[PDB]
Design a protein around this nucleic acid. Structure first.
Ligand SMILES: [Mg+2]
Ligand SMILES: [Mg+2]
Ligand SMILES: [Mg+2]
Ligand SMILES: [Mg+2]
Ligand SMILES: [Mg+2]
Ligand SMILES: [Zn+2]
Lengths: 135, 130, 93, 135, 38
RNA sequence: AGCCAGGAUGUUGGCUUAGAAGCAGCCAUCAUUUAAAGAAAGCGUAAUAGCUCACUGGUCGAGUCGGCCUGCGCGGAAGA
């Protein structure tokens, strides 16, 4: 889906997720989807929200995906004891802080942007709000 | 429903009460598009563009399209009274064309309120050169 | 050409700034030129309604502070991280 | 009273499959319809649906409305086409002019509810651009 | 009556009203539209 | 918000089934003839008829409408 095609190291630490975000301003497009909650998006959820909003605006006007999954989250299997190494790497997540703008859009009306980002925000685990550009 | 359009229609109505000595009571209650269609088809057929079936029939926009003249024609404002003006002749038979428009199968609510054209009696005056 | 009423803020830090943002008055600074910077604090209602319309980030502003008018220009604004709120405004004379 | 605005092509009379009982479903049969239909089809030039509009009273005698054929089909005979083009902005079939439309719509003074010549002109050009003949 | 857990107007004739502490959508025309937040 | 109201020609848009009329949708997509006028916005329509409504006037006489930041609540909420 959305994974880095090459990495230095296979399995990464868990790490905490504290502090406020960076990409708060809507840089590229005109209408952005700002995550007000705090959690981890995944490659599945990012591809699901992107194809939902592409169906929503009917492929007119540019989409921007801003956060990209590059932190692998591993899962030990079932019927496996707790020892014996860190488990195999299954899927990739992208850490989100409060304030991260996830998707941007231009070449669409404002109201169609509202409907599209509602339709794609209902497939993401973190609570998100709408935002527009400013100068 | 919009301020500057209301003011410019007031300006058009005072310019056209300057223009036409035939200001006429058209008093529809159930105003038919096909009576509008004959009233506009004959307007384009024997006029230019100046003639309409104009409804600016507001209770206090008639009273401020008034104050050019006919300053006792404010009580002809309310109670469903409409106004149509047209230039050539001293109350030409297009008055009776609009009257036949308000009388063709209609609900009998025309009543010719008067518009104070000759400063005469309230009745129907069809005294014309013809 | 807007006229914003300011007030000279006494003490500055993390604490007094967070107390002002609790009491609905975000702080701001005015630098520029050879004169000293000045520590102003503003209401949040008026300046959010002003920065809605985009002439606020465009034209010459005017600050009524201590009675004396100051012509100034909006330079650099820190917004809230995840809200429609303002944190701080850099003003250049 | 007791009318319709619908007719199939006036090259055929007594048209019992296409319209038929749309004119004579009621007690009035189709014999005066076909007789006077041919008698009015002889006036306007052929190759056109020349429509009849029925009235009636309680005496089974009347005088119908003999109206001019549609400018759709006047443009059809003007361009030589009957089935013009499906999906009218994909394939190219032709382009028409205001003078020819004046020559077509000069005689519609007793059928058109329009006292503007250029209104009829650009309206029938819009009819052509919905037909397939993009002007 | 579809007993949804998120009632939502689906036309213009639908009216959201509050009986007994629950929310309901009552429609004048289509009885499929009638809902209740339960 | 009620309330008495009214509400297209080009045209019944080319099609293509079968009749294309608002309904069968694609592609068009405006000039009014302009109180206001929808190549009608929906419905089930054998197309056949319409109901409304979009808007405008009457009546009536003090506020009304929809978004954001919110405090406290509501539903979501089923186990021996
Ligand atoms: Mg750490
Ligand atoms: Mg961090
Ligand atoms: Mg502290
Ligand atoms: Mg009960
Ligand atoms: Mg339930
Ligand atoms: Zn409903």
């Amino acid at each position: 889906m959305l994974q880095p095609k090459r990495t230095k190291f296979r399995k990464m630490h868990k790490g905490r997720n504290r502090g406020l975000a960076q990409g708060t301003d809507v840089s590229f497009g005109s209408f952005g989807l700002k995550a007000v909650g705090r959690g981890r998006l995944t490659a599945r959820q990012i591809e699901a929200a992107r194809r939902a909003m592409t169906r929503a605006v009917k492929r007119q006007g540019k989409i921007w995906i801003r956060v990209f999954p590059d932190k692998p989250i591993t899962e030990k299997p079932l019927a496996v004891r707790m020892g014996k190494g860190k488990g195999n790497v299954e899927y990739w997540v992208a850490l989100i802080q409060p304030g991260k703008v996830l998707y941007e859009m231009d070449g669409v009306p404002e109201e169609l942007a509202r409907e599209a980002f509602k339709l794609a925000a209902a497939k993401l685990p973190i609570k998100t709000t709408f935002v527009t550009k400013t100068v | 429903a919009l301020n500057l359009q209301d003011k410019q229609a007031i300006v058009a109505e005072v310019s056209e009460v300057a223009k036409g000595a035939l200001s006429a009571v058209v008093a529809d209650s159930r105003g038919v598009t096909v009576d509008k269609m004959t009233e506009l088809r004959k307007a384009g057929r024997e006029a230019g563009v100046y003639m309409r079936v104009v409804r600016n029939t507001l209770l206090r926009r008639a009273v401020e399209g008034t104050p050019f003249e006919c300053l006792k024609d404010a009580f002809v404002g309310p109670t469903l009274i409409a106004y149509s003006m047209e230039h050539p002749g001293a109350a030409a038979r297009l008055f009776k064309e609009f009257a036949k428009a308000n009388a063709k199968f209609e609900v009998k609510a025309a009543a010719f309120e008067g518009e104070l054209i000759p400063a005469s009696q309230i009745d129907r005056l069809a005294t014309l050169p013809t | 050409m807007f006229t914003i009423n300011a007030e000279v803020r006494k003490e500055q830090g993390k604490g007094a700034s967070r107390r002002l943002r609790a009491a609905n008055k975000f702080p701001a600074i005015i630098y520029g030129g050879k004169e000293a910077p000045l520590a102003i604090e503003l209401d949040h209602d008026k300046v959010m309604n002003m920065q809605a319309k985009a002439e606020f980030y465009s034209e010459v502003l005017t600050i009524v502070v201590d009675g004396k008018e100051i012509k100034v220009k909006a330079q650099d604004v820190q917004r809230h991280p995840y809200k429609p709120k303002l944190q701080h405004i850099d003003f250049v004379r | 009273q007791a009318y319709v605005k619908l007719q199939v092509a006036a090259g055929m009379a007594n048209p019992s499959p296409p319209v038929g009982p749309a004119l004579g479903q009621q007690g009035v049969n189709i014999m005066e319809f076909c007789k006077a239909f041919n008698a009015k089809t002889d006036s306007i030039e052929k190759g056109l649906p020349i429509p009849v509009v029925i009235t009636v009273y309680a005496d089974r005698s009347f005088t119908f409305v003999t109206k001019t054929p549609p400018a759709a089909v006047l443009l059809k005979k003007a361009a030589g086409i009957k089935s013009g083009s499906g999906k009218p902005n994909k394939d190219k079939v032709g382009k028409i002019s205001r003078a020819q439309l004046q020559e077509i719509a000069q005689t519609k003074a007793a059928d058109m509810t329009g006292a503007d010549i250029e209104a009829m002109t650009r309206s029938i050009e819009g009819t052509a651009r919905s037909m397939g003949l993009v002007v | 009556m579809k007993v949804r857990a998120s009632v939502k107007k689906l036309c213009r004739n639908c009216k959201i009203v509050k009986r007994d502490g629950v929310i309901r959508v009552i429609c004048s025309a289509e009885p499929k539209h009638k809902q209740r937040q339960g």
